[PDB]
Amino acid sequence: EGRVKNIVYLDFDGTITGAHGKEVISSPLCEALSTKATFDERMRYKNEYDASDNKIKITENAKNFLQDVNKLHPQVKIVIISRNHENYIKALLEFENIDHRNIIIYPRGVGNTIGPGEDKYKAVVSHEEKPECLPGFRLICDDDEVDGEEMCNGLIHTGRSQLVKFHNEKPGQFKWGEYFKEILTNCDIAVK
Ligand SMILES: [Mg+2]
C-alpha cells in the first residue's frame, strides 16, 4: 500500500534492554561487537552475551513486545533510535532470535561520521518527512526523559503529535503489554 500511519519509536539501551546507555556504550562487549558487520561475525559473541549480567540483555517483555508488533507489520512500523552501534543492536536482536528485517534502526555513526541516531530530534523529523509517512498513532518509549522529550519534540515540529503515547520508565519497568493494548486500540486498521 506504501503508507505508514502508525510508528513505534523506541530507544534501545535501558528501554529495550535493562541497562542505561551510559554503562553499556564503553563496555568491552559493546565495543567488540561495534565492528561485526555480519550475522556470522556477531553470532560468535552469543556465548559471552548469554553469560553477561542480565541487565545488558534485551528484556523478556521487550522481546515479546517486538515480536508482537512485528506481527502487525506493515500497518505498524518499529523504529529504533540510538546512539549505540548498529552492529551491537543487530547482534542483540539476533542473539534473542528476533527478526529485525522490517525494523528501522537509526544508530551511531562510524568514526568521525555522525549517524542519525545521535540526534533523536532530527531522527524523528527526518523519518516523519519520508513520503510514505502519514499522521496516525505514535508510541515513544525512552528510559531517559531528555532523550524522550527530544523525540516528542520531533513529532511536534512535523505536526505529527496529535495522537502520541509517551512512556518514560526506568529500565526493566516498561509496561509493554499496556503499550501493545494502546497500539491495538488506537490503530483500527491494525485490528485484523
Ligand atoms: Mg536509553
Bridge partners, 81 (sequence order): 11, 106
Would you list which residues are annotated within the binding site for Mg(2+)?
11, 13, 142-143
d(CA 104, CA 126): 13
Is the peptide bond prior to 116 cis by the omega test (within 30 degrees of 0)?
no
- The C-alpha cell 543487530 sits at 90
Say how many Å lie between the CA of residue 20 and the centre of ligand 1.
5
Rg (CA), the chain: 16
Cell numbers representing residue 52 in the block: 553477561
Cell numbers representing residue 90 in the block: 543487530
Alpha carbons within 13 A on the beta-carbon side of 62: 29
Say how many Å lie between the CA of residue 72 and the centre of ligand 1.
24
Q: What is the resolution of this structure in A?
A: 1.8
| Residue pair 9/79 in contact by the 8 Å Cβ criterion | yes
- Please write down the HEC assignment for all residues of the chain: CCCECCEEEEECCCCCECCCHHHCCCCHHHHHHCCCCCHHHHHCCHHHHHHCCHHHCECHHHHHHHHHHHCCCCCCEEEEECCCCHHHHHHHHHHCCCCCCCCEEECCCCCCCCCHHHCHHHHHHHHHCCCCECCCCEEEECCCHHHHHHHHHHHHHCCCCCCEEEECCCCCCCCHHHHHHHHHHHCCCCCC
CA 164 and chain centroid, separation: 16
Would you list which residues are annotated within the binding site?
11, 13, 142-143
d(CA 175, CA 61): 8
Dihedral of CA atoms 178, 181, 186, 192 in degrees, nearest 10, equals 160
- Per-position b or e across 105-123, b if 16+ CB within 10 A of its CB: bbbbeeeeeebbbbbbbbb
The domain spans of the chain are 1-192
d(CA 116, CA 171): 23
CA angle 35, 39, 45 (to 5 degrees): 65
d(CA 51, CA 95): 12
CA angle 71, 86, 156 (to 5 degrees): 70
Say how many Å lie between the CA of residue 171 and the centre of ligand 1.
8
From residue 176, give the alpha-carbon distance in Å to each of 20, 25, 65, 101, 151. Answer: 18, 24, 6, 21, 19
From residue 184, give the alpha-carbon distance in Å to each of 24, 31, 162, 178. Answer: 33, 38, 17, 10
Say how many Å lie between the CA of residue 1 and the centre of ligand 1.
33
Alpha carbons within 13 A on the beta-carbon side of 114: 6
